[PDB]
Amino acid sequence: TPQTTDAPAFPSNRSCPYQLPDGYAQLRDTPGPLHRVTLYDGRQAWVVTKHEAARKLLGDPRLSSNRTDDNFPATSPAFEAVRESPQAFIGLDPPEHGTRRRMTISEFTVKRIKGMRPEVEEVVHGFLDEMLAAGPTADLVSQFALPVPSMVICRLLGVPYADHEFFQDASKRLVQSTDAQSALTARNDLAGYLDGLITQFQTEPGAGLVGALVADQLANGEIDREELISTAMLLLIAGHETTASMTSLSVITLLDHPEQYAALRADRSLVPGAVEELLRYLAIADIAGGRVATADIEVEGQLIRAGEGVIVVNSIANRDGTVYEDPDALDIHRSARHHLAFGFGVHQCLGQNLARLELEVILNALMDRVPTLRLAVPVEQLVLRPGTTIQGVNELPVTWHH
Ligand code: HEM
Ligand SMILES: N#C/C(=C1/SC[C@@H](c2ccccc2Cl)S1)n1ccnc1
Numbered sequence: 205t206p207q208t209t210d211a212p213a214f215p216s217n218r219s220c221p222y223q224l225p226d227g228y229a230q231l232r233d234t235p236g237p238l239h240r241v242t243l244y245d246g247r248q249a250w251v252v253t254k255h256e257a258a259r260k261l262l263g264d265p266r267l268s269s270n271r272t273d274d275n276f277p278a279t280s281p282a283f284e285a286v287r288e289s290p291q292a293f294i295g296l297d298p299p300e301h302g303t304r305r306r307m308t309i310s311e312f313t314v315k316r317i318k319g320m321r322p323e324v325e326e327v328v329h330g331f332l333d334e335m336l337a338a339g340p341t342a343d344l345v346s347q348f349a350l351p352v353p354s355m356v357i358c359r360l361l362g363v364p365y366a367d368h369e370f371f372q373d374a375s376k377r378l379v380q381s382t383d384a385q386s387a388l389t390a391r392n393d394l395a396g397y398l399d400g401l402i403t404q405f406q407t408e409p410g411a412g413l414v415g416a417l418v419a420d421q422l423a424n425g426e427i428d429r430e431e432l433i434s435t436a437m438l439l440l441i442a443g444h445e446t447t448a449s450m451t452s453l454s455v456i457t458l459l460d461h462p463e464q465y466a467a468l469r470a471d472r473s474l475v476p477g478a479v480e481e482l483l484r485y486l487a488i489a490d491i492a493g494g495r496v497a498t499a500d501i502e503v504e505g506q507l508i509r510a511g512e513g514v515i516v517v518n519s520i521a522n523r524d525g526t527v528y529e530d531p532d533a534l535d536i537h538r539s540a541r542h543h544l545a546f547g548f549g550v551h552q553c554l555g556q557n558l559a560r561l562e563l564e565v566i567l568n569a570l571m572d573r574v575p576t577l578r579l580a581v582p583v584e585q586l587v588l589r590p591g592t593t594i595q596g597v598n599e600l601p602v603t604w605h606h
């Protein structure tokens with residue numbers, strides 16, 4: 205008996221770090237902006253598979269980001285960890301979203317990010333010093349890809365780096381969590397740590413965004429103590445995990461396209477455009493597109509009903525051939541403009557300027573300090589994270605000329 209389905213299972217896992225899963229490429233090819241899918245618990249939902257329609261729906265206020273809504277398209281049991289506690293502004297709609305987000309934007313401006321350039325370079329070259337002095341073979345993730353953005357975001361947040369082993373482990377346990385209880389345990393571990401950090405700042409006013417939020421908004425009752433915890437946790441995990449994944453996958457991808465890597469090294473003028481193309485191509489946050497319709501939405505003849513879950517899959521939208529000619533080809537020289545790796549609209553990634561800065565610095569540093577860098581194993585031996593979480597590899601064995 206045939207098993208062809210109208211709503212295939214979603215999400216799907218990558219088999220190649222920089223290629224869509226086979227199922228996603230099928231969704232990309234099927235005409236129309238929408239397609240039905242079956243989530244892990246049997247409920248059906250819509251997935252958006254085209255670029256301009258993704259922009260349109262991301263800007264549509266009728267698609268809500270409220271993750272506490274019972275009809276929100278949860279794609280894994282671990283998603284329950286964020287549903288039970290107060291929502292950081294990633295899970296808020298206007299006007300609450302803007303009031304909370306504006307409490308944090310000062311630390312992510314173009315002026316502040318450019319101001320952080322010397323300390324980002326210092327942290328990058330510091331962890332490179334330690335890795336190269338230790339010699340190959342090293343795991344690029346635990347020795348460079350993860351600690352670099354961890355240290356940077358901690359200094360931005362005011363989180364003491366001396367506790368890094370604790371909250372890096374709690375962050376990883378949440379990222380890789382495959383059940384609800386494990387995710388909630390790792391989340392409460394972070395919540396308990398951040399709550400004590402708040403009390404510490406109330407005794408002794410401190411630096412970083414968390415200290416600012418404690419001294420001002422919390423003391424004026426304009427943010428709840430548990431919203432501060434959720435917001436700080438969002439920035440902490442995002443600061444750690446997204447950049448680390450872009451680093452490891454950019455290294456894997458660039459080494460599989462050695463002509464473009466050598467061209468990139470020969471001209472650092474190309475690093476900014478190469479970073480945009482890597483963001484479009486790798487789209488490591490393609491699971492973070494969930495929305496729920498609060499009213500009927502008709503999309504090019506197809507009707508989204510109120511109460512239906514919608515998932516804007518930015519990896520698929522970033523492979524729209526009508527926007528990026530030959531979209532499945534990595535081209536660091538192409539115009540990667542208007543890609544959706546960071547989203548679009550009111551929720552577009554607050555840390556996008558920081559991720560762009562860190563990746564540029566990291567890529568330039570790897571080409572300067574370790575040009576003989578190469579993988580210590582075939583990419584087929586690398587272990588990919590599933591489509592239910594942030595795209596990445598659990599470890600990246602690398603070697604170089606000692
Ligand atoms: C290459 C790295 C990153 C990628 C690919 C990425 C991707 C995304 C995407 C697709 C969204 C949209 C979520 C939605 O529409 O529901 C988002 C939002 C967000 N990201 Fe990132 N992100 C990255 C790095 C970071 C970093 C380093 C931070 C540090 C704080 C961060 C913090 C946030 C926040 C706070 C939001 C929510 C903004 C809002 O709701 O107004 N991200 N990100
Ligand atoms: N990547 C990423 C990222 C995420 S927030 C929501 C996360 C998520 C949503 C739904 C299901 C599973 C997961 Cl894990 S993924 N982020 C955070 C800041 N900027 C980007």
Ligand SMILES: O=C(O)Cc1ccccc1Nc1c(Cl)cccc1Cl
Nearest residue numbers: 282283286292378379437438441442
């Ligand atoms: O979304 C959040 O509030 C925290 C956060 C920040 C960065 C990356 C992921 C997550 N959340 C998250 C995690 Cl770490 C695991 C499973 C499901 C979710 Cl929603």
